């Protein structure tokens, strides 16, 4: 191949009747064929057989298929969102979660020990409540991941804002990193403090002009309390009446006043705000990685159960007998997907019926056209035997 990159184990799920025979190799059993014949003998075939549950009716069988198709999508949507997040943060491999161990066992091996797993799910529950149950668990786990990720972005916004106050640039920068009683006045009846943000060139001009700029200004009040890289920050002490006159006269000169006035409760509340933002984001990040791996293993088990159930159910509907159906899951080596899909189609497709058989073989992963991509849902083409292609 070269129309798609694979570097992680790929899976095709098939279910076939246990009386079947391949016509691509007549004189073979289906099980023997998978191992020996299929893609140059390099196919790894894994067990995936599950037994009978309790089926409502034939009538009920129909309702179950429809739901299974829908829940399978929905879980698939969720598991993709969890993986996209873990990948996005780059604090956990981006190069795994396609063949990253579930229950600390390699993924093709995990499927090999997958025979219908128990977490809360038993073979003596009804099929309708297993379809429902599973979906409820998957939706809860994802909604949790979405909320904590939502919270983590609101926390990033707060940490940037707070930081800017702590040292940024004077157009919103509020002071609390300078706390001196020699640069600010407090407990004062006549005096107040106005901070003036001044361009670096203009610093000399400010130093000369300020006392005479407004009337009634404390002289030798100019001190550089803070400095950024574009602006210089000065403290000026003056009369409360005269603050209006300074802000206005200063703007004409091309100085930018920063309205700040010294009070203890503001200074303390700016430092706390910065502190709580940092603490909130850091807690959220660890919680976000821990939660996403734990949620991921549970949803993986949930998803494969719907795929196992579904393929069995769809077999039961289309073929009827035999009551137990031969399900295998085949782990395909990278870039041998195209060859795999074709050999199974040729061999088994005849059982589904000649009407069912269409040629549109091939695969386009680029958005140039939307033909050449099998799914029973579309009227454009159909799978010719119960086959799902699973791409992690």
């Amino acid at each position: 191949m070269a129309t798609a990159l694979y570097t992680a184990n790929d899976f095709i799920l098939i279910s076939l009747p246990q009386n079947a025979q391949p016509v691509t190799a007549p004189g073979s059993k289906t099980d023997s064929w998978f191992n020996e014949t299929l893609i140059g003998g390099r196919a790894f075939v894994s067990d995936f057989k599950i037994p009978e549950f309790k089926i409502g009716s034939l009538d009920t069988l129909i309702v179950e298929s429809e739901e299974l198709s829908k829940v399978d999508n929905q879980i698939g949507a969720s598991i993709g969102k969890i993986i996209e997040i873990l990948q996005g943060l780059n604090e956990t491999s981006t190069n795994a979660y396609r063949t990253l161990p579930i229950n600390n066992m390699p993924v093709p091996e995990y499927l090999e020990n997958f025979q219908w797993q128990t977490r809360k799910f038993k073979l003596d529950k009804s099929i309708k409540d297993l379809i429902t149950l599973i979906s409820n668990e998957s939706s809860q786990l994802d909604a949790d991941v979405r909320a904590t990720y939502a919270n983590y972005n609101s926390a990033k916004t707060n940490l940037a804002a707070a930081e800017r106050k702590k040292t940024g640039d004077l157009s919103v920068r509020s002071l609390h990193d300078i706390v001196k009683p020699e640069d600010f006045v407090l407990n004062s009846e006549h005096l107040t403090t106005v901070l003036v943000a001044v361009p670096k060139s203009l610093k000399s001009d400010f130093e000369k002009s300020y006392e005479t700029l407004s009337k009634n200004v404390v002289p030798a009040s100019a001190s550089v309390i803070a400095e950024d890289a574009e602006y210089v920050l000065f403290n000026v002490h003056l009369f409360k009446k005269n603050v209006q006159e300074f802000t206005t006269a200063a703007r004409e000169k091309k100085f930018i006043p920063r309205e700040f006035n010294y009070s203890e409760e503001l200074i303390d509340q700016l430092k706390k705000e910065h502190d709580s933002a940092a603490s909130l984001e850091q807690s959220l990040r660890v919680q976000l990685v821990r939660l996403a791996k734990t949620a991921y293993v549970d949803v993986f088990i949930n998803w494969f159960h719907i795929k196992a159930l579904r393929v069995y159910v769809e077999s039961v509907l289309r073929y009827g007998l035999p009551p137990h159906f031969n399900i295998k899951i085949i782990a395909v080596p990278p870039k041998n997907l195209s060859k795999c899909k074709s050999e199974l189609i040729d061999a088994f497709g005849f059982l589904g019926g000649n009407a069912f058989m269409k040629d549109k073989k091939g695969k386009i992963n680029k958005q140039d056209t939307s033909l050449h991509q099998y799914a029973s849902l579309v009227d454009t083409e159909y799978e010719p035997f119960v086959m799902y292609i699973i791409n992690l």
Partner: protein, 150 residues
């Protein structure tokens, strides 16, 4: 006279041809490689199609050089002329073909790895000409030299 200009034409025309090919294809490829860096090798094979026109061209040109130096006349000059032109026109024209096909075929190479052989085949039809210019020219060179003679 015309014989020198033969040498010259061979080199002018086929260089330019190959340039045209390399440019046109190049831009398409350079663009494409950002989607999938895995088509590096594939993509190069269209570009190398225009590289081979010129090397044939050097073989005919070099011959004429040996047969030149001396003051000739009409007879050698026109037969050397005609040989130059031959490598010249195939180089120019095939070179031209390749860049066009090549660009649109970068989409072919990308989506189709199995109709990639089809893509080569279109390009490969242009390479037929390079041969025609060259074979006819080689024949011409040996016969051309008589030296002088109006």
């Amino acid at each position: 006279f015309f014989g020198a200009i033969g040498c010259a034409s061979a080199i002018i025309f086929t260089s330019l041809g190959a340039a045209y090919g390399t440019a046109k294809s190049g831009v398409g490829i350079c663009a494409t490689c950002v989607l999938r860096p895995d088509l590096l090798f594939k993509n190069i094979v269209p570009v190398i199609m225009a590289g081979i026109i010129a090397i044939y061209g050097l073989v005919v040109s070099v011959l004429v050089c040996y047969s030149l130096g001396q003051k000739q006349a009409l007879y050698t000059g026109f037969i050397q002329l005609g040989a130059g032109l031959s490598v010249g026109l195939s180089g120019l024209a095939a070179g031209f073909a390749i860049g066009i096909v090549g660009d649109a075929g970068v989409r072919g190479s990308s989506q189709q790895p199995r109709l990639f052989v089809g893509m080569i085949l279109i390009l490969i039809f242009a390479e037929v000409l390079g041969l025609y210019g060259l074979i006819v020219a080689l024949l011409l060179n040996s016969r051309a030299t008589q030296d002088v003679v109006c």
